[PDB]
Amino acid sequence: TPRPYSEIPSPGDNGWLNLYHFWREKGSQRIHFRHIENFQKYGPIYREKLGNLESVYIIHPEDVAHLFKFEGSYPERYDIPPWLAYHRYYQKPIGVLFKKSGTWKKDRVVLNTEVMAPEAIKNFIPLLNPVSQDFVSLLHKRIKQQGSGKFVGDIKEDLFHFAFESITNVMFGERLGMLEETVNPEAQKFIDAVYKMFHTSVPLLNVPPELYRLFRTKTWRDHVAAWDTIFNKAEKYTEIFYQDLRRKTEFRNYPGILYCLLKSEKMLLEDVKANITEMLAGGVNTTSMTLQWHLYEMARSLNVQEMLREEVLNARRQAEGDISKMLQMVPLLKASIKETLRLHPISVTLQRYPESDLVLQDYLIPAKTLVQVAIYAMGRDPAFFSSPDKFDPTRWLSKDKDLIHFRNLGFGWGVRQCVGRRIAELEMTLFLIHILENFKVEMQHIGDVDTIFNLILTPDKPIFLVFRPF
Numbered sequence: 001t002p003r004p005y006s007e008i009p010s011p012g013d014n015g016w017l018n019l020y021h022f023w024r025e026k027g028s029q030r031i032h033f034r035h036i037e038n039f040q041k042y043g044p045i046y047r048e049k050l051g052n053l054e055s056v057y058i059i060h061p062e063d064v065a066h067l068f069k070f071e072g073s074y075p076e077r078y079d080i081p082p083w084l085a086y087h088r089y090y091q092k093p094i095g096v097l098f099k100k101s102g103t104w105k106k107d108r109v110v111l112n113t114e115v116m117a118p119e120a121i122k123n124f125i126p127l128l129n130p131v132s133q134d135f136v137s138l139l140h141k142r143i144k145q146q147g148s149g150k151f152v153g154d155i156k157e158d159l160f161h162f163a164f165e166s167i168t169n170v171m172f173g174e175r176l177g178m179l180e181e182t183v184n185p186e187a188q189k190f191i192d193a194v195y196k197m198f199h200t201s202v203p204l205l206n207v208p209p210e211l212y213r214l215f216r217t218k219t220w221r222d223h224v225a226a227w228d229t230i231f232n233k234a235e236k237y238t239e240i241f242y243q244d245l246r247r248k249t250e251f252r253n254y255p256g257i258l259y260c261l262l263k264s265e266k267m268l269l270e271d272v273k274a275n276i277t278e279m280l281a282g283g284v285n286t287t288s289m290t291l292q293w294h295l296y297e298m299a300r301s302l303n304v305q306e307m308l309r310e311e312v313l314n315a316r317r318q319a320e321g322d323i324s325k326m327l328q329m330v331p332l333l334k335a336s337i338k339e340t341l342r343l344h345p346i347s348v349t350l351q352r353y354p355e356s357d358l359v360l361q362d363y364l365i366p367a368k369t370l371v372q373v374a375i376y377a378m379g380r381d382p383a384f385f386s387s388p389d390k391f392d393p394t395r396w397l398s399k400d401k402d403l404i405h406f407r408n409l410g411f412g413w414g415v416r417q418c419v420g421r422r423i424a425e426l427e428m429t430l431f432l433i434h435i436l437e438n439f440k441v442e443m444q445h446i447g448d449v450d451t452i453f454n455l456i457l458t459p460d461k462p463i464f465l466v467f468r469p470f
Protein backbone atom coordinates (compact mmCIF):
# COMPACT_ATOMS: atom_id res chain seq x y z
CA THR A 1 0.00 0.00 0.00
CA PRO A 2 1.25 3.54 -0.72
CA ARG A 3 1.70 6.21 1.97
CA PRO A 4 -1.55 8.21 2.48
CA TYR A 5 -2.01 11.73 0.97
CA SER A 6 -2.02 13.61 4.27
CA GLU A 7 1.53 12.22 4.70
CA ILE A 8 3.08 14.39 1.94
CA PRO A 9 5.51 16.81 3.69
CA SER A 10 3.79 20.31 3.35
CA PRO A 11 4.31 23.26 5.72
CA GLY A 12 1.05 22.75 7.52
CA ASP A 13 -2.61 21.95 7.23
CA ASN A 14 -3.37 25.57 8.16
CA GLY A 15 -4.03 27.44 4.90
CA TRP A 16 -4.62 30.87 6.38
CA LEU A 17 -1.47 30.62 8.47
CA ASN A 18 0.53 29.84 5.34
CA LEU A 19 -0.96 32.87 3.59
CA TYR A 20 0.09 35.16 6.41
CA HIS A 21 3.60 33.81 5.99
CA PHE A 22 3.49 33.95 2.20
CA TRP A 23 2.30 37.56 2.44
CA ARG A 24 4.92 38.46 5.04
CA GLU A 25 7.76 36.93 3.08
CA LYS A 26 6.85 38.97 0.01
CA GLY A 27 6.38 35.73 -1.97
CA SER A 28 3.58 37.01 -4.23
CA GLN A 29 6.10 37.56 -7.07
CA ARG A 30 8.81 35.11 -6.04
CA ILE A 31 6.58 32.03 -6.40
CA HIS A 32 9.24 30.26 -8.49
CA PHE A 33 12.00 30.94 -6.08
CA ARG A 34 9.89 29.27 -3.33
CA HIS A 35 9.48 26.15 -5.43
CA ILE A 36 13.26 25.83 -5.37
CA GLU A 37 13.48 26.34 -1.61
CA ASN A 38 10.40 24.22 -0.85
CA PHE A 39 11.76 21.20 -2.83
CA GLN A 40 15.08 21.77 -1.12
CA LYS A 41 13.28 21.52 2.19
CA TYR A 42 10.62 18.86 1.68
CA GLY A 43 12.42 16.79 -1.05
CA PRO A 44 10.92 15.62 -4.38
CA ILE A 45 7.30 16.34 -3.55
CA TYR A 46 5.31 18.53 -1.22
CA ARG A 47 1.97 20.18 -0.52
CA GLU A 48 1.06 23.74 0.44
CA LYS A 49 -2.43 24.93 1.10
CA LEU A 50 -2.87 28.73 0.74
CA GLY A 51 -6.25 29.65 2.15
CA ASN A 52 -8.40 26.91 0.66
CA LEU A 53 -6.23 26.43 -2.37
CA GLU A 54 -4.17 23.22 -1.97
CA SER A 55 -1.99 21.43 -4.47
CA VAL A 56 0.97 18.97 -4.77
CA TYR A 57 4.19 19.81 -6.40
CA ILE A 58 6.52 17.63 -8.36
CA ILE A 59 9.83 17.99 -10.04
CA HIS A 60 11.39 14.59 -11.05
CA PRO A 61 10.89 13.72 -14.76
CA GLU A 62 9.70 10.13 -14.03
CA ASP A 63 6.92 11.64 -11.95
CA VAL A 64 5.84 14.12 -14.55
CA ALA A 65 5.88 11.25 -16.99
CA HIS A 66 3.74 9.17 -14.68
CA LEU A 67 1.38 12.02 -13.79
CA PHE A 68 0.57 12.53 -17.45
CA LYS A 69 -0.67 8.92 -17.71
CA PHE A 70 -3.73 9.93 -15.59
CA GLU A 71 -4.32 13.44 -17.09
CA GLY A 72 -7.07 12.03 -19.27
CA SER A 73 -8.68 12.32 -22.64
CA TYR A 74 -9.95 15.88 -21.91
CA PRO A 75 -7.33 17.33 -19.51
CA GLU A 76 -7.67 20.28 -17.09
CA ARG A 77 -4.99 22.62 -15.87
CA TYR A 78 -5.27 25.26 -13.14
CA ASP A 79 -7.79 27.95 -14.00
CA ILE A 80 -6.63 31.52 -13.21
CA PRO A 81 -9.34 32.71 -10.81
CA PRO A 82 -9.17 36.39 -11.90
CA TRP A 83 -9.41 35.49 -15.67
CA LEU A 84 -12.23 33.13 -15.01
CA ALA A 85 -13.93 35.59 -12.73
CA TYR A 86 -14.00 38.42 -15.33
CA HIS A 87 -15.66 36.18 -17.92
CA ARG A 88 -18.33 34.72 -15.65
CA TYR A 89 -18.98 37.96 -13.86
CA TYR A 90 -19.34 39.81 -17.21
CA GLN A 91 -20.70 36.76 -19.01
CA LYS A 92 -18.19 36.89 -21.88
CA PRO A 93 -18.00 33.92 -24.32
CA ILE A 94 -15.08 31.70 -23.41
CA GLY A 95 -12.94 29.56 -25.70
CA VAL A 96 -10.47 26.76 -25.54
CA LEU A 97 -8.66 28.35 -22.57
CA PHE A 98 -11.64 28.10 -20.19
CA LYS A 99 -13.74 25.50 -22.02
CA LYS A 100 -14.31 22.26 -20.14
CA SER A 101 -14.90 18.61 -21.32
CA GLY A 102 -16.39 17.58 -24.72
CA THR A 103 -17.27 21.24 -25.23
CA TRP A 104 -13.53 21.89 -24.96
CA LYS A 105 -12.45 19.03 -27.28
CA LYS A 106 -14.84 20.15 -29.96
CA ASP A 107 -13.05 23.51 -30.49
CA ARG A 108 -9.55 22.09 -30.13
CA VAL A 109 -10.06 19.56 -32.96
CA VAL A 110 -11.02 22.38 -35.31
CA LEU A 111 -8.22 24.56 -33.96
CA ASN A 112 -5.49 22.00 -34.42
CA THR A 113 -6.31 21.56 -38.08
CA GLU A 114 -6.05 25.31 -38.53
CA VAL A 115 -2.97 26.23 -36.46
CA MET A 116 -1.05 23.01 -35.60
CA ALA A 117 -1.48 20.73 -38.67
CA PRO A 118 1.77 20.53 -40.76
CA GLU A 119 0.16 22.15 -43.80
CA ALA A 120 -1.50 25.06 -41.98
CA ILE A 121 2.15 25.44 -40.86
CA LYS A 122 3.63 25.45 -44.35
CA ASN A 123 0.95 27.98 -45.26
CA PHE A 124 2.44 30.32 -42.63
CA ILE A 125 5.99 30.60 -43.98
CA PRO A 126 4.97 33.41 -46.42
CA LEU A 127 2.96 35.28 -43.77
CA LEU A 128 5.72 35.22 -41.15
CA ASN A 129 8.92 35.35 -43.15
CA PRO A 130 8.26 38.92 -44.43
CA VAL A 131 7.47 40.25 -40.93
CA SER A 132 10.85 39.05 -39.80
CA GLN A 133 12.64 40.69 -42.69
CA ASP A 134 10.92 43.98 -41.80
CA PHE A 135 12.43 43.63 -38.33
CA VAL A 136 15.93 43.20 -39.71
CA SER A 137 15.27 46.45 -41.51
CA LEU A 138 14.00 48.39 -38.49
CA LEU A 139 17.30 47.44 -36.85
CA HIS A 140 19.05 48.53 -40.01
CA LYS A 141 17.12 51.82 -39.78
CA ARG A 142 18.56 52.30 -36.24
CA ILE A 143 22.18 51.40 -36.80
CA LYS A 144 22.30 54.07 -39.53
CA GLN A 145 20.56 56.25 -36.96
CA GLN A 146 22.88 56.19 -33.92
CA GLY A 147 25.43 56.80 -36.64
CA SER A 148 28.46 54.77 -35.51
CA GLY A 149 27.45 51.46 -37.16
CA LYS A 150 25.59 49.75 -34.34
CA PHE A 151 22.54 49.91 -32.07
CA VAL A 152 22.32 50.00 -28.31
CA GLY A 153 19.08 49.82 -26.31
CA ASP A 154 16.17 47.91 -24.96
CA ILE A 155 14.19 46.45 -27.88
CA LYS A 156 11.46 44.86 -25.76
CA GLU A 157 8.79 47.16 -27.15
CA ASP A 158 9.86 46.25 -30.68
CA LEU A 159 9.63 42.58 -29.77
CA PHE A 160 5.97 43.30 -28.87
CA HIS A 161 5.19 44.97 -32.18
CA PHE A 162 7.00 42.30 -34.09
CA ALA A 163 4.95 39.66 -32.29
CA PHE A 164 1.60 41.37 -32.54
CA GLU A 165 2.09 41.82 -36.28
CA SER A 166 3.07 38.15 -36.67
CA ILE A 167 -0.12 36.91 -34.92
CA THR A 168 -2.27 39.43 -36.74
CA ASN A 169 -0.85 38.70 -40.19
CA VAL A 170 -1.54 34.97 -39.75
CA MET A 171 -5.10 35.40 -38.48
CA PHE A 172 -6.09 38.22 -40.81
CA GLY A 173 -3.56 38.29 -43.67
CA GLU A 174 -3.15 42.03 -43.43
CA ARG A 175 -0.23 44.09 -42.25
CA LEU A 176 -0.48 46.75 -39.48
CA GLY A 177 2.91 48.47 -39.55
CA MET A 178 3.84 48.09 -35.91
CA LEU A 179 7.39 48.22 -37.27
CA GLU A 180 6.83 51.70 -38.88
CA GLU A 181 8.09 55.11 -37.68
CA THR A 182 4.69 55.91 -36.17
CA VAL A 183 2.75 52.83 -35.07
CA ASN A 184 -0.99 52.41 -34.49
CA PRO A 185 -1.96 53.81 -31.04
CA GLU A 186 -5.11 51.61 -30.87
CA ALA A 187 -2.88 48.58 -31.32
CA GLN A 188 -0.47 49.71 -28.67
CA LYS A 189 -3.51 49.99 -26.40
CA PHE A 190 -4.33 46.28 -26.95
CA ILE A 191 -0.68 45.25 -26.55
CA ASP A 192 -0.31 47.00 -23.27
CA ALA A 193 -3.71 45.64 -22.30
CA VAL A 194 -2.42 42.04 -22.63
CA TYR A 195 0.53 42.87 -20.43
CA LYS A 196 -1.55 44.92 -18.00
CA MET A 197 -4.02 41.95 -17.61
CA PHE A 198 -1.09 39.71 -16.74
CA HIS A 199 0.66 42.09 -14.38
CA THR A 200 -2.57 42.81 -12.45
CA SER A 201 -3.51 39.14 -11.93
CA VAL A 202 -0.79 38.37 -9.44
CA PRO A 203 -2.37 40.20 -6.42
CA LEU A 204 -5.67 38.66 -7.44
CA LEU A 205 -4.67 34.96 -7.37
CA ASN A 206 -4.68 34.22 -3.64
CA VAL A 207 -7.92 36.02 -2.78
CA PRO A 208 -11.53 35.04 -3.26
CA PRO A 209 -12.77 36.48 -6.54
CA GLU A 210 -16.10 37.54 -5.08
CA LEU A 211 -14.09 39.46 -2.50
CA TYR A 212 -12.06 41.61 -5.08
CA ARG A 213 -14.09 44.74 -4.49
CA LEU A 214 -12.87 45.01 -0.84
CA PHE A 215 -9.39 43.60 -0.38
CA ARG A 216 -8.27 44.35 -3.91
CA THR A 217 -10.46 47.24 -5.20
CA LYS A 218 -7.78 48.91 -7.39
CA THR A 219 -5.97 45.84 -8.91
CA TRP A 220 -9.43 44.55 -9.85
CA ARG A 221 -10.45 47.81 -11.59
CA ASP A 222 -7.26 47.68 -13.65
CA HIS A 223 -7.49 43.98 -14.53
CA VAL A 224 -11.16 44.45 -15.52
CA ALA A 225 -10.08 47.32 -17.74
CA ALA A 226 -7.23 45.40 -19.41
CA TRP A 227 -9.68 42.65 -20.46
CA ASP A 228 -12.22 45.18 -21.77
CA THR A 229 -9.47 46.57 -24.05
CA ILE A 230 -8.49 43.02 -25.13
CA PHE A 231 -12.10 42.29 -26.04
CA ASN A 232 -13.25 45.39 -27.89
CA LYS A 233 -10.05 45.64 -29.93
CA ALA A 234 -9.91 41.95 -30.89
CA GLU A 235 -13.65 42.36 -31.63
CA LYS A 236 -12.92 45.36 -33.96
CA TYR A 237 -10.24 43.59 -36.02
CA THR A 238 -12.63 40.64 -36.34
CA GLU A 239 -15.39 42.81 -37.84
CA ILE A 240 -13.33 45.02 -40.19
CA PHE A 241 -11.68 41.80 -41.45
CA TYR A 242 -14.84 39.70 -41.71
CA GLN A 243 -15.96 42.59 -43.97
CA ASP A 244 -12.45 42.63 -45.55
CA LEU A 245 -13.22 39.33 -47.33
CA ARG A 246 -17.00 39.24 -46.99
CA ARG A 247 -17.37 41.29 -50.21
CA LYS A 248 -14.01 41.17 -52.02
CA THR A 249 -13.47 37.41 -52.17
CA GLU A 250 -13.15 36.17 -55.73
CA PHE A 251 -9.81 34.33 -55.57
CA ARG A 252 -7.19 32.37 -53.58
CA ASN A 253 -4.01 32.83 -51.51
CA TYR A 254 -3.56 32.18 -47.73
CA PRO A 255 -4.38 30.65 -44.49
CA GLY A 256 -6.42 33.42 -42.97
CA ILE A 257 -7.21 31.86 -39.64
CA LEU A 258 -10.29 34.17 -39.43
CA TYR A 259 -11.20 32.94 -42.96
CA CYS A 260 -10.44 29.24 -42.54
CA LEU A 261 -12.55 28.98 -39.36
CA LEU A 262 -15.39 30.53 -41.35
CA LYS A 263 -14.88 28.19 -44.35
CA SER A 264 -14.21 24.81 -42.63
CA GLU A 265 -17.70 25.40 -41.11
CA LYS A 266 -16.96 23.26 -38.07
CA MET A 267 -17.36 26.02 -35.44
CA LEU A 268 -20.20 28.33 -34.51
CA LEU A 269 -19.83 32.08 -34.80
CA GLU A 270 -19.93 32.78 -31.03
CA ASP A 271 -16.69 30.88 -30.60
CA VAL A 272 -14.57 32.19 -33.45
CA LYS A 273 -14.71 35.71 -31.96
CA ALA A 274 -13.69 34.26 -28.60
CA ASN A 275 -11.01 31.91 -29.91
CA ILE A 276 -9.47 34.55 -32.13
CA THR A 277 -9.41 36.99 -29.21
CA GLU A 278 -7.49 34.35 -27.23
CA MET A 279 -5.05 33.59 -30.01
CA LEU A 280 -4.41 37.26 -30.75
CA ALA A 281 -3.73 37.70 -27.05
CA GLY A 282 -1.36 34.75 -26.98
CA GLY A 283 1.07 36.07 -29.65
CA VAL A 284 1.76 39.52 -27.98
CA ASN A 285 4.28 38.90 -25.08
CA THR A 286 5.13 35.24 -24.97
CA THR A 287 7.23 35.22 -28.16
CA SER A 288 8.50 38.64 -27.26
CA MET A 289 9.87 37.58 -23.83
CA THR A 290 11.25 34.36 -25.20
CA LEU A 291 12.97 35.98 -28.18
CA GLN A 292 14.44 38.56 -25.84
CA TRP A 293 15.92 35.88 -23.64
CA HIS A 294 17.33 33.91 -26.59
CA LEU A 295 19.16 37.10 -27.75
CA TYR A 296 20.17 37.76 -24.17
CA GLU A 297 21.64 34.24 -23.98
CA MET A 298 23.36 34.45 -27.32
CA ALA A 299 25.14 37.54 -25.94
CA ARG A 300 26.03 35.65 -22.73
CA SER A 301 27.79 33.07 -24.87
CA LEU A 302 29.46 34.09 -28.10
CA ASN A 303 30.83 30.60 -28.90
CA VAL A 304 27.20 29.43 -29.06
CA GLN A 305 26.08 32.48 -30.99
CA GLU A 306 28.69 31.53 -33.63
CA MET A 307 27.68 27.83 -33.83
CA LEU A 308 24.16 29.03 -34.60
CA ARG A 309 25.42 31.50 -37.14
CA GLU A 310 27.43 28.68 -38.74
CA GLU A 311 24.39 26.41 -39.08
CA VAL A 312 22.12 29.19 -40.33
CA LEU A 313 24.66 30.41 -42.93
CA ASN A 314 25.05 26.73 -43.80
CA ALA A 315 21.44 26.04 -44.57
CA ARG A 316 21.56 29.16 -46.75
CA ARG A 317 24.61 28.49 -49.00
CA GLN A 318 23.71 24.73 -48.82
CA ALA A 319 20.00 24.80 -49.59
CA GLU A 320 19.96 27.67 -52.09
CA GLY A 321 16.20 27.30 -51.77
CA ASP A 322 14.02 29.79 -50.01
CA ILE A 323 13.22 29.65 -46.31
CA SER A 324 11.04 26.54 -46.50
CA LYS A 325 13.97 24.33 -47.56
CA MET A 326 16.33 25.56 -44.84
CA LEU A 327 13.83 25.10 -41.96
CA GLN A 328 14.79 21.43 -41.76
CA MET A 329 18.49 22.07 -41.90
CA VAL A 330 18.66 24.01 -38.60
CA PRO A 331 18.37 21.50 -35.66
CA LEU A 332 20.80 23.40 -33.33
CA LEU A 333 18.64 26.47 -33.80
CA LYS A 334 15.34 24.82 -32.89
CA ALA A 335 17.11 23.11 -30.00
CA SER A 336 18.37 26.63 -29.09
CA ILE A 337 14.80 27.68 -28.56
CA LYS A 338 14.12 24.78 -26.23
CA GLU A 339 17.30 25.57 -24.29
CA THR A 340 15.65 28.95 -23.88
CA LEU A 341 12.30 27.72 -22.69
CA ARG A 342 14.39 25.57 -20.28
CA LEU A 343 16.12 28.59 -18.70
CA HIS A 344 13.22 30.94 -19.15
CA PRO A 345 9.92 29.37 -19.35
CA ILE A 346 6.92 31.46 -19.82
CA SER A 347 4.88 29.06 -17.53
CA VAL A 348 6.27 28.75 -13.97
CA THR A 349 4.54 25.35 -13.76
CA LEU A 350 2.17 22.93 -15.60
CA GLN A 351 -0.78 21.72 -13.67
CA ARG A 352 -3.12 18.69 -14.21
CA TYR A 353 -6.24 17.49 -12.38
CA PRO A 354 -5.79 13.59 -12.47
CA GLU A 355 -8.88 11.77 -13.84
CA SER A 356 -8.34 8.84 -11.46
CA ASP A 357 -6.30 8.24 -8.27
CA LEU A 358 -2.61 7.42 -8.68
CA VAL A 359 0.55 7.36 -6.67
CA LEU A 360 3.56 9.64 -7.01
CA GLN A 361 6.83 8.63 -5.52
CA ASP A 362 5.16 6.63 -2.79
CA TYR A 363 2.01 8.45 -1.84
CA LEU A 364 -1.57 8.18 -2.82
CA ILE A 365 -2.73 11.06 -5.00
CA PRO A 366 -6.52 11.21 -4.95
CA ALA A 367 -8.11 11.94 -8.27
CA LYS A 368 -9.15 15.53 -8.82
CA THR A 369 -6.29 17.01 -6.80
CA LEU A 370 -4.30 19.92 -8.25
CA VAL A 371 -0.90 18.60 -9.07
CA GLN A 372 1.74 20.91 -10.38
CA VAL A 373 4.96 20.70 -12.33
CA ALA A 374 7.79 22.95 -11.37
CA ILE A 375 9.01 23.78 -14.84
CA TYR A 376 10.98 26.81 -13.74
CA ALA A 377 12.65 24.72 -10.96
CA MET A 378 13.31 21.63 -13.04
CA GLY A 379 15.18 23.96 -15.39
CA ARG A 380 17.63 25.15 -12.72
CA ASP A 381 18.29 21.87 -10.86
CA PRO A 382 21.74 20.25 -11.50
CA ALA A 383 20.11 16.84 -10.78
CA PHE A 384 18.44 17.08 -14.16
CA PHE A 385 20.83 19.07 -16.30
CA SER A 386 24.62 19.20 -16.07
CA SER A 387 25.70 22.79 -15.24
CA PRO A 388 22.12 24.19 -15.51
CA ASP A 389 23.54 27.71 -15.71
CA LYS A 390 25.21 27.03 -19.03
CA PHE A 391 23.26 27.77 -22.22
CA ASP A 392 23.72 24.50 -24.09
CA PRO A 393 21.70 23.88 -27.21
CA THR A 394 23.39 20.47 -27.64
CA ARG A 395 21.36 19.29 -24.64
CA TRP A 396 18.33 18.77 -26.86
CA LEU A 397 20.02 16.67 -29.57
CA SER A 398 22.95 14.53 -28.28
CA LYS A 399 20.90 11.26 -28.56
CA ASP A 400 24.08 9.03 -28.65
CA LYS A 401 25.60 9.09 -25.16
CA ASP A 402 22.11 9.47 -23.60
CA LEU A 403 20.54 6.45 -21.88
CA ILE A 404 17.69 8.68 -20.85
CA HIS A 405 16.03 11.56 -22.57
CA PHE A 406 13.36 14.01 -21.58
CA ARG A 407 11.36 16.23 -23.92
CA ASN A 408 11.02 20.01 -23.43
CA LEU A 409 8.03 21.17 -21.52
CA GLY A 410 8.01 24.92 -22.14
CA PHE A 411 4.87 24.27 -24.23
CA GLY A 412 3.31 21.71 -22.00
CA TRP A 413 2.38 18.21 -23.33
CA GLY A 414 -0.35 15.89 -24.43
CA VAL A 415 -3.47 16.97 -26.17
CA ARG A 416 -3.88 20.22 -24.24
CA GLN A 417 -0.48 21.67 -24.74
CA CYS A 418 -0.06 25.11 -26.37
CA VAL A 419 -2.36 25.32 -29.41
CA GLY A 420 -0.14 28.29 -30.44
CA ARG A 421 2.89 26.10 -29.87
CA ARG A 422 3.61 25.61 -33.52
CA ILE A 423 3.00 29.19 -34.65
CA ALA A 424 5.36 30.42 -31.93
CA GLU A 425 8.03 27.91 -32.76
CA LEU A 426 8.10 28.85 -36.44
CA GLU A 427 7.78 32.58 -35.78
CA MET A 428 10.82 32.48 -33.51
CA THR A 429 12.77 30.17 -35.78
CA LEU A 430 12.51 32.55 -38.74
CA PHE A 431 13.22 35.68 -36.66
CA LEU A 432 16.44 34.10 -35.58
CA ILE A 433 17.64 33.00 -38.99
CA HIS A 434 17.26 36.57 -40.18
CA ILE A 435 18.78 37.97 -36.94
CA LEU A 436 21.53 35.43 -37.34
CA GLU A 437 22.52 36.12 -40.93
CA ASN A 438 22.51 39.90 -40.16
CA PHE A 439 23.66 40.90 -36.60
CA LYS A 440 26.28 39.85 -34.03
CA VAL A 441 24.37 40.88 -30.83
CA GLU A 442 26.21 41.47 -27.51
CA MET A 443 25.56 43.34 -24.28
CA GLN A 444 27.23 46.59 -23.07
CA HIS A 445 28.39 44.93 -19.85
CA ILE A 446 28.29 41.92 -17.53
CA GLY A 447 24.70 40.61 -17.85
CA ASP A 448 22.98 39.62 -14.61
CA VAL A 449 19.21 39.59 -15.08
CA ASP A 450 16.85 37.45 -12.97
CA THR A 451 13.21 36.58 -13.41
CA ILE A 452 10.15 37.90 -11.68
CA PHE A 453 6.72 36.38 -11.44
CA ASN A 454 3.98 38.19 -13.29
CA LEU A 455 1.51 35.40 -14.25
CA ILE A 456 3.99 34.80 -17.08
CA LEU A 457 7.62 34.96 -16.12
CA THR A 458 9.62 37.98 -17.43
CA PRO A 459 13.05 39.38 -16.78
CA ASP A 460 13.10 41.82 -13.73
CA LYS A 461 15.20 44.74 -15.19
CA PRO A 462 15.35 46.03 -18.81
CA ILE A 463 17.71 44.30 -21.18
CA PHE A 464 20.09 46.33 -23.32
CA LEU A 465 21.32 44.61 -26.40
CA VAL A 466 23.97 45.59 -28.92
CA PHE A 467 23.51 44.79 -32.69
CA ARG A 468 26.46 45.03 -35.14
CA PRO A 469 26.31 43.80 -38.82
CA PHE A 470 27.80 40.45 -40.16
Ligand code: HEM
Binding pocket: 077, 096, 097, 108, 167, 278, 279, 280, 281, 282, 283, 284, 286, 287, 290, 346, 347, 350, 351, 409, 410, 411, 412, 413, 416, 417, 418, 419, 420, 421, 423, 424
Ligand atom coordinates in the same frame (compact mmCIF):
# COMPACT_ATOMS: atom_id res chain seq x y z
C1 HEM B 1 6.91 30.90 -26.64
C2 HEM B 1 5.36 31.12 -26.77
C3 HEM B 1 4.46 30.44 -26.07
C4 HEM B 1 4.56 29.48 -24.93
C5 HEM B 1 5.76 29.02 -24.23
C6 HEM B 1 3.31 29.09 -24.65
C7 HEM B 1 3.10 28.19 -23.51
C8 HEM B 1 1.99 27.55 -23.30
C9 HEM B 1 1.76 26.80 -22.05
C10 HEM B 1 2.81 26.12 -21.20
C11 HEM B 1 0.48 26.59 -21.97
C12 HEM B 1 -0.14 25.64 -20.99
C13 HEM B 1 0.16 24.21 -21.51
C14 HEM B 1 -0.58 23.08 -20.82
O1 HEM B 1 -1.66 23.31 -20.24
O2 HEM B 1 0.01 21.88 -20.98
C15 HEM B 1 -0.20 27.38 -23.05
C16 HEM B 1 -1.66 27.52 -23.32
C17 HEM B 1 -2.09 28.07 -24.50
N1 HEM B 1 -1.50 29.12 -25.22
FE1 HEM B 1 0.42 29.24 -25.35
N2 HEM B 1 2.32 29.56 -25.40
C18 HEM B 1 2.94 30.61 -26.15
C19 HEM B 1 2.56 31.04 -27.37
C20 HEM B 1 1.16 31.10 -27.68
C21 HEM B 1 0.61 31.61 -28.77
C22 HEM B 1 1.28 32.46 -29.85
C23 HEM B 1 -0.84 31.64 -28.48
C24 HEM B 1 -1.91 31.92 -29.44
C25 HEM B 1 -1.78 31.64 -30.74
C26 HEM B 1 -0.96 31.22 -27.23
C27 HEM B 1 -2.27 30.72 -26.74
C28 HEM B 1 -2.37 29.57 -26.05
C29 HEM B 1 -3.72 29.01 -25.75
C30 HEM B 1 -5.03 29.60 -26.20
C31 HEM B 1 -3.51 27.92 -25.00
C32 HEM B 1 -4.58 27.17 -24.26
C33 HEM B 1 -4.81 25.83 -24.99
C34 HEM B 1 -5.79 24.90 -24.33
O3 HEM B 1 -5.96 24.90 -23.09
O4 HEM B 1 -6.44 24.08 -25.18
N3 HEM B 1 0.25 30.80 -26.75
N4 HEM B 1 0.87 27.99 -23.79
Ligand SMILES: CC(C)CC[C@@H](O)[C@@H](C)[C@H]1CC[C@H]2[C@@H]3CC=C4C[C@@H](O)CC[C@]4(C)[C@H]3CC[C@]12C
Binding pocket: 078, 079, 080, 097, 278, 281, 282, 286, 346, 347, 348, 349, 350, 351, 455, 456
Ligand atom coordinates in the same frame (compact mmCIF):
# COMPACT_ATOMS: atom_id res chain seq x y z
C1 LIG C 1 -5.30 34.54 -23.12
C2 LIG C 1 -3.82 34.31 -22.88
C3 LIG C 1 -3.54 34.52 -21.38
C4 LIG C 1 -3.19 33.00 -23.38
C5 LIG C 1 -1.78 32.93 -22.83
C6 LIG C 1 -1.09 31.59 -22.88
O1 LIG C 1 -0.39 31.50 -24.10
C7 LIG C 1 -0.10 31.26 -21.74
C8 LIG C 1 1.01 32.33 -21.64
C9 LIG C 1 -0.76 30.86 -20.37
C10 LIG C 1 -1.97 29.94 -20.48
C11 LIG C 1 -1.96 29.01 -19.28
C12 LIG C 1 -1.10 29.79 -18.31
C13 LIG C 1 -0.82 29.22 -16.88
C14 LIG C 1 -2.11 29.04 -16.04
C15 LIG C 1 -1.78 28.72 -14.58
C16 LIG C 1 -0.49 28.66 -14.12
C17 LIG C 1 -0.33 28.41 -12.62
C18 LIG C 1 -0.19 29.78 -11.86
O2 LIG C 1 -0.08 29.60 -10.44
C19 LIG C 1 1.09 30.48 -12.39
C20 LIG C 1 0.89 30.81 -13.89
C21 LIG C 1 0.55 29.58 -14.78
C22 LIG C 1 1.79 28.73 -14.95
C23 LIG C 1 0.12 30.15 -16.14
C24 LIG C 1 1.31 30.59 -17.05
C25 LIG C 1 0.79 31.29 -18.32
C26 LIG C 1 0.06 30.26 -19.21
C27 LIG C 1 1.05 29.22 -19.67
